[PDB]
Amino acid sequence: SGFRKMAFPSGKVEGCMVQVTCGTTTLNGLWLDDVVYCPRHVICTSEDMLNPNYEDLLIRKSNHNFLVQAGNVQLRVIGHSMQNCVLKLKVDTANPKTPKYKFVRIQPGQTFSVLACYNGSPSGVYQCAMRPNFTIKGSFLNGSCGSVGFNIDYDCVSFCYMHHMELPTGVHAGTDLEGNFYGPFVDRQTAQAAGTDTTITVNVLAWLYAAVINGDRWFLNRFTTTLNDFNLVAMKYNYEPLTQDHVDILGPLSAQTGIAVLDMCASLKELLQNGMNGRTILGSALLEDEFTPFDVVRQCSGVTF
Amino acid sequence: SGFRKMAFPSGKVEGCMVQVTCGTTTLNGLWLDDVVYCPRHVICTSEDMLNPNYEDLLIRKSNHNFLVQAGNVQLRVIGHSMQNCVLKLKVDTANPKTPKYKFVRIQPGQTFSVLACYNGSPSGVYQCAMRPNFTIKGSFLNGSCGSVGFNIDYDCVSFCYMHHMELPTGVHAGTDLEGNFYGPFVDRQTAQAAGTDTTITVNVLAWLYAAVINGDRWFLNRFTTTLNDFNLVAMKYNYEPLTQDHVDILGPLSAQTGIAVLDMCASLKELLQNGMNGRTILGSALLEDEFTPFDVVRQCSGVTF
Numbered sequence A, B: 001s002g003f004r005k006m007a008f009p010s011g012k013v014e015g016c017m018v019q020v021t022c023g024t025t026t027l028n029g030l031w032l033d034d035v036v037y038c039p040r041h042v043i044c045t046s047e048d049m050l051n052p053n054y055e056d057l058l059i060r061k062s063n064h065n066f067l068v069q070a071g072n073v074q075l076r077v078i079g080h081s082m083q084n085c086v087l088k089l090k091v092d093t094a095n096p097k098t099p100k101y102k103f104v105r106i107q108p109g110q111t112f113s114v115l116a117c118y119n120g121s122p123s124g125v126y127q128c129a130m131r132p133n134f135t136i137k138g139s140f141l142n143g144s145c146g147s148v149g150f151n152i153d154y155d156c157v158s159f160c161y162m163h164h165m166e167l168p169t170g171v172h173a174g175t176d177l178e179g180n181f182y183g184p185f186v187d188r189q190t191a192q193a194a195g196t197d198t199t200i201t202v203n204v205l206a207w208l209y210a211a212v213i214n215g216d217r218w219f220l221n222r223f224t225t226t227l228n229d230f231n232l233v234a235m236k237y238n239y240e241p242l243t244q245d246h247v248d249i250l251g252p253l254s255a256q257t258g259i260a261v262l263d264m265c266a267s268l269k270e271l272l273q274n275g276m277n278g279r280t281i282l283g284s285a286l287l288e289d290e291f292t293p294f295d296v297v298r299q300c301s302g303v304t305f
């Protein structure tokens, strides 16, 4: 029993974190095999950030301008290239701690663990989700760039995020491990703002199924809804539209609890209208949206209470 | 910016987790140097759990009755002894991944990271606190016994908790690494219940300082209070008494924000007497009490390990 915001064990990722320095800029890098991946803005000063010409800044660099530190050992850079917003530094030592890994680009609503790092050293691990407006509500200070997001289903680490910046509202933006940004952001200090964010509906429904699995049904009602009527109501509360894909994905949780997806949708509609009336659901007074259907199945018992 | 429930990086602990099996009971063990620490109830069957005589059950066991598995390697048990509610299995191989460590007993209100394990394999990491009633609100399923709680200070892991059981309300109970229970609990299947819990006042105040640091100030007011008058309010809402030690401990956060501790106590009194009026603090509609003053300072400073 219990339901916590649970992160994957971070050990496989801790053994890949390094410090990358180019001149006066220092940030984190990810060392996998003989390559160190890091944000390309490591070659920028604060002045360069308004309109950086990365190709022009990079051509003026040699391999020995990049200092890579793994623990107390200095790695030697023997090659460099840029791929989108990521800089790839070829080093003369393959990481002996390289886990089995994949680079995966995730969609909004998907969750992942973040290993926050400073100066190539891990400080903490937390769970979060890619918001519908492609930002993440992380906890990052200056020096955290290059920190990564990942999932570890089975023994393989799937790297999905690399940290690049903090927007004016305090939320965060970054790229996949191929250097493609999530959302309409650029690695430039220009007027950029997070779009209006919405609640991840399929995740709230999954978390309501987690509450039922753990023994709570106070919020259920005798009603059902059509998918279209649910979306007309949900959109009024800034909730993401629920698609047939989302209804299909909730199938297993629906069968484990005996509650049809559209019947759980009717319960969500009523909760939006009424609030919780002093009650909590899994220790929260708000409707939680950072647990996916897959996360609930991973954490919860297969036997409903 | 941002404020997340953050756990310590778990890698140093992942390298210590093993599987311990005695007959039909399988659980997790902690392998440090040439000793495996695990709950003594591994020697019990379901029938024995009703009323066990642990010395009598243990005397009937030989070293070969304990199967210890570290990854895919079988460790050979060469000795065994009991210390309170923990079984210590002497093995013929010292753990090459043993980190610098200490066994420490924590007090209620203190937080720690839990590395939830099943069959000697880590599945997740989450942060939690020792409640005033000596239980923890964890997330544990059958097979999680032997999972440990810890903190990190520089390179030293301080092990503070070992998981033993779940109470009828879904909360959890366990021991320090010397086998002494936290709380008036016993390691047997008998009528046991968590006592009435209270809110960790110094932690709520620390989290209000974290909200101020992050730009959330709507709850601040021009008023102050005395420690005696605030304690009269705290007792009425099932909040733990605030002491002069707690006021001293909040000193640094008070200086970083310019808000006196009794000034923040007057804000908490108003939140207790009036609620939040539809507003949230750090994305929560409840007053959060599982972040200590030290946790707030560490997360708002980027301390690494």
Ligand SMILES: CNC(=O)CN1C[C@]2(CCN(c3cncc4ccc(Cl)cc34)C2=O)c2cc(Cl)ccc2C1=O
Pocket (backbone or CB within 6 Å): A041, A049, A140, A141, A142, A143, A144, A145, A164, A165, A166, A167, A186, A187, A188, A189, A190, B001
């Ligand atoms: C809040 N940002 C700033 O005032 C200056 N700023 C620097 C920077 C690089 C570092 N960084 C941060 C990344 N995460 C957490 C941060 C927390 C506090 C600060 Cl001040 C900075 C953080 C940025 O956002 C950046 C990188 C890129 Cl690709 C594009 C733009 C910027 C940028 O605008």
Ligand SMILES: CNC(=O)CN1C[C@]2(CCN(c3cncc4ccc(Cl)cc34)C2=O)c2cc(Cl)ccc2C1=O
Pocket (backbone or CB within 6 Å): A001, B041, B049, B140, B141, B142, B143, B144, B145, B164, B165, B166, B167, B186, B187, B188, B189, B190
């Ligand atoms: C809820 N527990 C039970 O019905 C049976 N139960 C078994 C047990 C050992 C395993 N364990 C669990 C530990 N964490 C999460 C659990 C989640 C679901 C279950 Cl069914 C068990 C869990 C216990 O609590 C135990 C150990 C000790 Cl030292 C003293 C008593 C017990 C005990 O009463």
Ligand SMILES: [Cl-]
Pocket (backbone or CB within 6 Å): A105, A106, A107, A110
């Ligand atoms: Cl995805």
